[PDB]
Paper text:
The papain-like protease (PLpro) domain is part of the SARS-CoV-2 non-structural protein (nsp)-3, and represents an essential protease and validated drug target for preventing viral replication. As a conserved papain-like Cys protease from the C16 family, PLpro hydrolyses amino acid sequences with a specific Leu-Xaa-Gly-Gly motif, found at the junctions between nsp1/2, nsp2/3 and nsp3/4 (where Xaa is Asn, Lys or Lys, respectively). Importantly, the same motif is present within a subset of human proteins that are also targeted by PLpro/nsp3; most notable are the C-terminus of human ubiquitin and the ubiquitin-like modifier, Interferon Stimulated Gene 15 (ISG15) that comprise a Leu-Arg-Gly-Gly motif. Moreover, the fact that PLpro also acts as a deubiquitinase (DUB) and deISGylase, enables the exploitation of many tools and assays to measure PLpro activity.
We co-crystallized 3k with a mutant form of SARS-CoV-2 PLpro in which the catalytic Cys111 was changed to Ser (PLproC111S), which we and others found to yield a more stable enzyme. The best crystal diffracted to 2.66 Å, and structure determination by molecular replacement revealed the structure of the PLpro bound to 3k. The new crystal form (space group P21212, see a list of all SARS-CoV-2 crystal forms in our associated Review) has two molecules in the asymmetric unit; both molecules are superimposable with an RMSD of 0.51 Å, and show excellent electron density for the ligand in identical ligand binding sites. The (R)-enantiomer of the compound was used for co-crystallisation and lies in the binding site. 3k occupies the channel required by the enzyme to hold to the C-terminal tail of ubiquitin and ISG15, which is on two sides lined by the static core of the PLpro Thumb domain and held in place by the more flexible blocking loop (aa 267-272), termed BL2, an extended β-hairpin that folds over the compound binding site. Tyr268 at the turn of BL2 restrains the central piperidine ring, almost entirely burying it in the enzyme; the piperidine amino group further forms a hydrogen bond with the side chain of Asp164 of the Thumb domain. The naphthyl ring extends into a hydrophobic pocket towards the ubiquitin binding bowl in PLpro, packing against Pro247 and Pro248. On the other side of the molecule extending towards the catalytic Cys, a substituted phenyl group is connected to the para-position of the piperidine ring by an amide-linker that forms interactions with both the domain and BL2, including through a key hydrogen bond between the compound amide and the backbone carbonyl of BL2 Tyr268. The substituted phenyl ring extends outwards from the domain core, due to side-chain rotation of Leu162, which blocks the path to the catalytic Cys111. As a result, 3k and related compounds appear to wrap around BL2, remotely from the catalytic Cys111 (closest compound distance 9.7 Å), yet directly competing with ubiquitin/Ubl-tail binding to the protease channel.
Author numbering: 3 to 188, 191 to 221, 230 to 312
The structure:
């Protein structure tokens, strides 16, 4: 007639529940999840004894636990998170060239590119959930991390995606306090701008950091930079990537609707990771759209 299970919103604060085995999880707790799976319309099974189930933050204390773990106020988050998990737990996360990648599935090229990128850039997350999941991802267990990335990016599994937007959302939940950017426009008169938060490390309209320092078009040029990396993005275009001149890059092949992402890293030679696939070469030219670089500080 009963079993003892645990209910949680963060899988940190576990709450003991006695569950009647004659009623579904849905009737007793509302939407209920077991490792991403929806058990709402399912009655308890004997194998569920002792197991931890996700519920939704329907009171105030659960909302606070959810905020302090996910740094989110969105109630659907948990639900969306769970959905992603149920799929991303079945993905494969092989090591390629010393990095955790994703075997291709559900149109996830942009997630694999973003993940490899994050692993090659100095970035600490703010939300405890992201910290724990990213730690586990770097160790080859990236299911939770990817499901969370989907959840924060308000994207569902199987849906094509943009790496630059993904990095945008991620950086918003990252510690960029030590970052600052300063630019100028050369319109009559001095027009210096200081940029903080995401816009201190992201730029759209050229792949070339050095061009950003020389100026793009009125002309705008980088006066000062304090960050551990930078991301230079531009609409996909033919571009040459020379070993040692960059850290990594996103290649996009296709049109605005249907496309494919590959990842270019600068180790000893140029490496190209495409999910589980890996190739090497001495040089590379192709359609690039994001290029990452390592900076500590810059002054024009
Ligand atoms: C980096 C690239 C991009 C960025 C900027 C301009 C682009 C022009 C043409 C093609 C790609 C361009 N980016 C790649 C991923 C794209 C994407 O997620 N497409 C999904 C999609 C699916 C259906 C309709 C749609 F408008 C968009 C969005 C665009
Ligand atoms: Zn509690
Ligand atoms: Zn059964
Ligand atoms: Zn906090
Ligand atoms: Zn699936």
């Amino acid at each position: 007639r009963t079993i003892k299970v645990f209910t949680t919103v963060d899988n940190i604060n576990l709450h003991t529940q006695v569950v009647d085995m004659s009623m579904t999880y849905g009737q007793q707790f509302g939407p209920t999840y077991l490792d991403g799976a929806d058990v709402t319309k399912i009655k308890p099974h004997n194998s569920h004894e002792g197991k931890t189930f996700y519920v939704l933050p329907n009171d105030d204390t659960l909302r606070v636990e959810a905020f302090e773990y996910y740094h989110t106020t969105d109630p659907s988050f948990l639900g969306r998170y769970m959905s992603a998990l149920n799929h991303t737990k079945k993905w494969k996360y092989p090591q390629v060239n010393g990095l955790t990648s994703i075997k291709w599935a559900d149109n996830n090229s942009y997630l694999a590119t973003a993940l490899l990128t994050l692993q090659q850039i100095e970035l600490k997350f703010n939300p405890p959930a992201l910290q724990d999941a990213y730690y586990r991802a770097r160790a080859g267990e990236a299911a939770n991390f990817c499901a969370l990335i989907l959840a924060y990016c308000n994207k569902t599994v199987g849906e094509l995606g943009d790496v630059r937007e993904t990095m945008s959302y991620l950086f918003q939940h990252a510690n960029l306090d030590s970052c600052k950017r300063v630019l100028n426009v050369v319109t009559c008169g001095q027009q210096q701008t200081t940029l903080k938060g995401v816009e201190a490390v992201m730029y759209m309209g050229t792949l070339s950091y050095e061009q950003f320092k020389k100026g793009v078009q009125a002309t705008k040029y980088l006066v000062q930079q304090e960050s551990p990396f930078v991301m230079m993005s531009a609409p996909p275009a033919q571009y040459e990537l020379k070993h040692g001149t960059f850290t990594c890059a996103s290649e996009y092949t296709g049109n605005y609707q249907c496309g494919h992402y590959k990842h270019i890293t600068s180790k000893e030679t140029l490496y190209c990771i495409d999910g589980a696939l890996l190739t090497k070469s001495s040089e590379y030219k192709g359609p690039i759209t994001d290029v990452f670089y390592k900076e500590n500080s810059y002054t024009t």
